[PDB]
Subunit: 215 residues, 6 copies
């Protein structure tokens, strides 16, 4: 990554063994459960494109996912090139999409862009592309559709709501989209005894109020 030294300059630092292992382990244990994405983002704080490729490439298995991600990255890189078409001796060159993705750029080139004044934040740009690709994989690999999340006849309302919002989260539902699904489905698919209670609360009931009423 790039970190700040004591002088106040942004300098390169090796990716740590703890960072490397943490990312490998979370994929091993959680695959593409939705909470892996914020973990990838946090573990890749300050990452160069090289560091981002290191993290992706240290994943063994899930190679269908990793190949889909490459295809998403190539699409995003192709769009970058469409909007930013691109040498003076000793001067900074403009990055291509594949430079941002770390496959045609050197580490020192990446550092130069990231620490430039103003910076070309190739690490942040690449990370956005990766997360776009990971979000498609999370959505693709969700085992449940929200329409099939119905409360069981003896299922605690709390457990049903957990499934409902887990499923919705895997869908990358906006707050707009998440609120539409709740309004359309949450009460309507609660079990009969809980459903009558929630209707009395009205459309303005908070989730907290609904969960208290059906406990």
């Amino acid at each position: 990554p790039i970190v700040q030294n004591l002088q106040g300059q942004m300098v390169h630092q090796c990716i740590s063994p703890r960072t490397l292992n943490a990312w490998v382990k979370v994929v091993e244990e959680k695959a593409f459960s939705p909470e892996v994405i914020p973990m990838f983002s946090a573990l890749s704080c300050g990452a160069t494109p090289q560091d981002l490729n290191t993290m992706l490439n240290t994943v063994g298995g899930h190679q269908a996912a990793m190949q889909m991600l490459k295809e998403t990255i190539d699409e995003e890189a192709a769009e970058w090139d469409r909007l930013h078409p691109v040498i003076a001796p000793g001067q900074m060159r403009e990055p291509r999409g594949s430079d941002i993705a770390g496959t045609t750029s050197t580490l020192q080139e990446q550092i130069g862009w990231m620490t430039h004044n103003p910076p070309i934040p190739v690490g942040e740009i690449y990370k956005r592309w990766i997360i776009l690709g990971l979000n498609k994989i999370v959505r693709m690999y969700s085992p449940t559709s929200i329409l099939d999340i119905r409360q069981g006849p003896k299922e605690p309302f709390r457990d049903y709501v957990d499934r409902f919002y887990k499923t919705l989260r895997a869908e990358q539902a906006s707050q707009e989209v998440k609120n539409a699904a709740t309004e359309t489905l949450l009460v309507q698919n609660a079990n009969p005894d809980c459903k009558t209670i929630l209707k009395a609360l009205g459309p303005g009931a908070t989730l907290e109020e609904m969960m208290t009423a059906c406990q």
Copy 2:
């Protein structure tokens, strides 16, 4: 977070793998037992709003709780906006800026390291902990009225259950100290209750626990 480096300057630092994993593991093992809140607060020492959202978002499962929390945050942001309406100069934070959803990391650092600081990390953390406390209370399984000492239950074990329940119900510290002379005695088993009655008013918890040992 924003921490002071070894030279005296306040600088941004990445959240560490250790911090990230500690928070995930605490929720996995303890869910929303009350002691998870002080752990969240300490693990988020110096957090920017971005760091706080990272910690919340790295939790898998418990999405009913996480959605209630989001709703609490939105209420607090709306109250912030009600009290604080809004080249190269610094903008005032709205509620969604404090909550990290409409503000950038560099903007959050700008507010936090401003002179004087706008401590958006601390403000957001207060909102989050307000929401976590409501979750703790909702997921508290027992009322203090149903914690009664079993006929052969050691008084120490009963007192442990009583004050565990009280903490999850989030009785004030005053009610915790006051229940020592009222409800704690009333729900003791007959043999110990007779002993506690003889102690008279004003017995400390230590004195009650010694007397029913």
Copy 3:
């Protein structure tokens, strides 16, 4: 905690994940065995009152103990207020007992007292109160009285002495008090075959000499 930076000033530092987990784990594993107190003291090196409350509050369970500790702290805070009764714009205010205990003072107020010249060491004062309370809990929760520690007919003298001084330690026995109990009980409650041997050594026998003689 408060640590020294490279300039030589005492500055605040976040409590570490390793510190936080170490304290939680030792209570989980050892409860109020006597050696937990020196571990609490060492893990709270340089702690602010806020850090001390964090450590106590991260304990789940043992809430009888934690409530007894609160009562001890309130007593000590009440005595502080009795001896130190207590605003100029921009100036340091004198701490109340509840300020030392971290419930009515801010972190920046605590730092100001701790780093003042001369310091008001509110962290050290509060820690003393906590350890006073923990010592009462260790003593209360000891399963054995020293009068019931007698050497078994086939028990190795070493194992008996281990039980004897474990029990005495839980009692918070002074060195004065610890020596009186040894003189009163250790030989007198050794088993007959070992007891005759130790009497011959006389009252000046070291423990080492007694343990060698009864092996």
Copy 4:
């Protein structure tokens, strides 16, 4: 390794216990699965040739692989020597100097921190990774031609096996993207193959995986 300290200077640092153990554990658990190579590269960030030899030498077992690697290193050193023939002044590195067997740590630091640097650590690492890639390929157990979707095998699981095998066989990224329209369809089971045929040319992998879900 050679890293920049908190003041801006490039200095030698001991390889850490954490780095040492991570590398040993990765080989123990994964042997020469392809993802071990990027892990070796990152764990050897900033390595001197001495550090690289330390990491290789701390591996127990797999000595057939380690001997093949030594032979690959010797070939690369010979090609280096073919292209680069050789008081108080700095000497030029031979292949065995780059590989750390005839050069001292202080000489390696001298080359790496020279202006301009002779990056013997990076050169040696390239040779090593060339040798590790040959080991990965040799120890690849299956040909891509034998990865065929089972009649009830989920298409996702088959695609995982297909691209795992392709990676171990070290098909180029072009061949990986090209096989999506050719071999991946051909080795699908009849039911999914009919679906993929109807998709027409140009289907992305995501589109194929959705279609056979």
Copy 5:
């Protein structure tokens, strides 16, 4: 401990959780096996007397041993006092000051960082290690005279037991090297003893172990 910071100054640092846990775990797993002493010494690198008492006091159990240690410390403190009788100026340490029971941390730092230093941490550690060595010897279960090679016991295994026992009995290094020609042969089984006799005097341990392999 007192350590030098990254700038060159000797400063106090808190004992770390890692150090604290390592010491507790070593005693839990190994009790007073002889190799625990060098581990205690290294883990207490730079320790103040306060740190040394922390490490000793964090041990649970083994209180017979800990009481013997206290008695040894008191003897050493008394000998110190016998040899060293005692506004804003520095006071001389008594034995109980060196042992950390009557001195404050700031006083201990004052002595240790004085010019010239009064190294109370090192002095106390010597006393402690003197006491730990006596505990190691007392808890040594076997005499070297009872370590004899079994009729089918590999000579290497017998030599391991012999020198483990010798270390716990704390034979000098001279006696360890001298026993190679005397007791080690005498307690070997008949078949190996005949071989060792033929080797003649002056055989190294390596030569004896090869000969009885």
Copy 6:
């Protein structure tokens, strides 16, 4: 160890708990398998003689080995004394063999030699002696001779080669010595079906070529 500070001076640093435990654990788990030596060397980076003795002395068990190592060290120290026979107030004294081995020298004496201009690298000299002794122990404790490594009738050629070069490594075989053993034994002791294949490749076949041909 001795590490560089920010000024650029070589200063003493305490050996770390992680270093201490790593060395103890690798001996517990691996004994004197050949790869333990490079681990000892790496874990003792920058070590003083005191640190080297700490590492050796924290090993419990294997005391036959540890005593052999002492004998090797004493031999090397005796040779040092033979080549370097050895006080001015406040001046550096020349180290004896036992000073290099850390038994007659203080830590501050060792630091003075190691950080002198020019340095007397007593830590590096001692480490060489220790590794010489450990190499003799690795060789002594190898369970197999290379002459007994023959390929099984159903054993994969890869597994046979692994055993062959493991055994050779434990022998401390040079590259010269290692190549002579391969030329003498590797094909000659391959099983019949694999042996005919390798002979056709000729004496210039790489190992890679031999392993491909017999898979």
